[PDB]
């Protein structure tokens, strides 16, 4: 409703870097808000793409941002009669970023890895890796839970079980309020997908440079499966957290698996031991139900509700025809121990190929009426195909079915405006929470400031 679309703030990164592919708000130890921006194709030292991360101080005028530096060099370690190797070329550093406390986590889902032993090898594969930084102190650490040192022949002899070679850990990421980093790894266990969790504190204290393979004992990984419903499900394509079991001492995980069950798609809610509490099934095959998930209480009863994006949903139209437009599903959490039911509300896009529901961002309470609100992105939406973000306001019965406000991309065709979104943080300290929108195709980020309701 009350985001100001007249005076925006623009930040920009290098041409071709995909600056804006991911972003988050970051608060320094003093509560000063900055914006961390991933740019997963930023050029490294060897004039080769490795990705990079930027930490943008808040300024009404925006502009350029300093780098948040991470080690971009390939590593080798001969130890235990083996040769360990990391390969950072085209790793996509900054393909996801998230901030917690005064720490920043930036992931390179396509970092490759191999172990050589005489004439044998693990196979060079994208295990992915996450980099951690505490900007104020300069501390650095890494977390790469799918790295292993088993040789190729052993997987074959063991029928490819517990095969974490193609994890792409960090493909998605989130951090619990208590500081547990949770990574989605859609390629885990031969393309089923897995989650990996570990406290940020233990990641820092157990890491040392050059080791490459090390133990984080408090870590916890999800499980392989023989059930074909899970095969190629990309469980962990998206992830989120929230409170869904009524017990405030446990944190529940929300996991998107957009190709679950022969591309039907699914979203699952789990306890922190990866035991399944609920499963929402996609409505239409290939719709990519679970591409995005958001958790926020929209109807003011203190119970977290779930939103799920299916950006390729095809809506039924006149004459037995189907139009790909995308759809968002709202599920309101019921009082006490009970199942989430059918969706409480379906939101459906209008522009052909617009990908409505490609991202969904909680806004906190934008207009300050006591109900939390959301923004939904349609990165190729709008009458001109340039991209739109639509704001929907919470209300006692869930969400309004019609957008209170629509933000049209200020960038040229192809920017993917809205592909990444983040809200619910007051960056200019005016008492209203604001919205940051990534347009990686244009290597820019736009900041929309919320203003008093007119």
């Amino acid at each position: 409703l009350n985001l100001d679309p007249v005076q925006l703030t623009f930040y920009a990164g290098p041409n071709g870097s995909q600056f804006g592919f991911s972003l988050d708000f970051h608060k320094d130890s003093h509560g000063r808000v900055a914006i961390v921006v991933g740019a997963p194709r930023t050029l490294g030292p060897s004039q080769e793409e490795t990705g990079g991360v930027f930490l943008c101080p808040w300024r009404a005028e925006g502009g350029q941002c300093p780098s948040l530096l991470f080690d971009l060099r390939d590593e080798t370690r001969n130890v235990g009669s083996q040769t360990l190797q990391t390969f950072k070329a085209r790793q996509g550093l900054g393909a996801s970023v998230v901030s917690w406390s005064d720490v920043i986590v930036a992931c390179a889902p396509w970092q490759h890895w191999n172990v050589l032993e005489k004439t044998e090898e693990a196979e060079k594969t994208p295990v992915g890796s996450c980099f951690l930084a505490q900007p104020e102190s300069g501390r650095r650490a890494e977390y790469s839970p799918c790295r292993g040192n088993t040789l190729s022949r052993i997987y074959v002899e063991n029928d490819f079980s517990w095969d974490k070679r193609y994890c792409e850990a960090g493909f998605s990421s989130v951090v619990t309020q208590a500081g547990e980093l949770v990574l989605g790894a859609p390629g885990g266990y031969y393309f089923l997908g897995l989650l990996a969790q570990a406290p940020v504190a233990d990641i820092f204290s157990s890491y040392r440079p050059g080791i490459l393979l090390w133990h984080v004992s408090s870590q916890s990984l999800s499980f392989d499966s023989s059930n074909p419903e899970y095969f190629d499900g990309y469980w962990g394509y998206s992830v989120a957290v929230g409170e869904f079991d009524g017990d405030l001492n446990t944190t529940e995980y929300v996991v998107g698996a957009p190709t679950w069950s022969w591309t039907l798609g699914a979203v699952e809610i789990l306890d922190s031991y990866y035991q399944r509490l609920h499963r929402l099934r996609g409505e239409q095959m290939a719709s990519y139900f679970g591409h995005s998930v958001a958790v926020t209480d929209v109807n003011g009863d203190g119970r977290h509700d779930l939103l799920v994006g299916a950006p390729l949903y095809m809506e039924s139209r006149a004459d037995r025809k189907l139009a790909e437009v995308g759809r968002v599903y709202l599920f309101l959490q019921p009082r006490g121990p009970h199942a989430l039911g059918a969706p409480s509300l379906l939101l459906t896009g209008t522009q052909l190929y617009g990908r409505f529901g490609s991202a969904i961002a909680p806004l906190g309470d934008l207009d300050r009426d006591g109900y939390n609100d959301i923004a939904v992105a349609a990165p190729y939406g709008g009458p001109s195909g340039r991209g739109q973000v639509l704001v929907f306001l919470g209300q006692s019965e869930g969400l309004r079915s019609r957008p209170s406000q629509v933000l049209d991309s200020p960038f040229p065709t192809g920017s993917a405006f809205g592909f990444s979104l983040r809200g619910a943080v007051d960056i200019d300290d005016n008492g209203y929470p604001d919205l940051i929108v990534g347009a990686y195709g244009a290597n820019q980020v736009a900041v929309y400031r919320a203003q008093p309701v007119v």
């Epitope: 370690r77 001969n78 130890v79 235990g80 009669s81 040192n149 052993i154 063991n158 157990s206 890491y207 040392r208 050059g210 080791i211 393979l213 090390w214 133990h215 004992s217």
Partner: antibody, heavy 119, light 108 residues
């Protein structure tokens, strides 16, 4: 807290066999490699081998090929070192060991099991 | 196998001294070395891993250094508890092999 609690001193005769145990305490034995090391006053410290209790895969120093058999039961959070065709020279103290962080290191040690082979 | 020649086999020193134990490998081992401590009639405690890294709980008066095939453990300002046996171990290659050991003894 990580502790490796090994079985008690053994007292056996030459030609016999004995099986020692190393029980994880405060952690899952399946988390890391578990090694066995032999110590004698004269010969010093010798690496026997290791096992990955998650899957049972072992490595040995060729010197101990034949006498030493390393096993593990994740159920009883325990790892074993079986010695066969015992001899005077098998008389020594035996330790189980696991790394702290580095996959390949040797940082945590059990209290050690004394073995004496005599007639 | 890689041979680990640890020196000296023993040394007589006193509370407060700064002493160094060295270890030489029969080939480069790129910092894949550990240092261990055995107190009289007790088990072992880890001190250092990967050349220079303190094991959790070990006081900083202990420090490890070196590269290629030559490494050193150094103890600044010896404490009463520091009189014991010390061993280096290489894990660059299987089989892991150990140094001959070093015993710190009270001078008088």
């Amino acid at each position: 807290e990580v502790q490796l609690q090994q079985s008690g001193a053994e007292l056996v005769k030459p030609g016999a066999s004995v099986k020692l145990s190393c029980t994880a305490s405060g952690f899952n034995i399946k988390d890391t490699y578990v090694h066995w090391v032999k110590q004698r006053p004269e010969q010093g410290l010798e690496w026997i081998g290791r096992i990955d209790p998650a899957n049972g895969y072992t490595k040995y120093d060729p010197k101990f090929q034949g006498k030493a058999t390393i096993t593990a039961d994740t159920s009883s959070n325990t790892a074993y070192l079986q010695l066969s065709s015992l001899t005077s020279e098998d008389t020594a103290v035996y330790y189980c060991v696991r790394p702290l962080y580095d996959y390949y290191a040797m940082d945590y040690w059990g209290q050690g099991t004394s073995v004496t082979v005599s007639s | 196998d890689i041979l680990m020649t640890q020196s000296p086999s023993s040394m007589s020193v006193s509370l407060g001294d700064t002493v160094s134990i060295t270890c030489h490998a029969s080939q480069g081992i790129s910092s894949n070395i550990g240092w261990l401590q055995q107190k009289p009639g007790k088990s072992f405690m880890g001190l250092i891993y990967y050349g220079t890294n303190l094991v959790d709980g070990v006081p900083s008066r202990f420090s490890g250094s070196g590269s290629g095939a030559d490494y050193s453990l150094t103890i600044s300002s010896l404490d009463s508890e520091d009189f014991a046996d010390y061993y280096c171990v290489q894990y660059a290659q299987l089989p892991y092999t150990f140094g001959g050991g070093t015993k710190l003894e009270i001078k008088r």
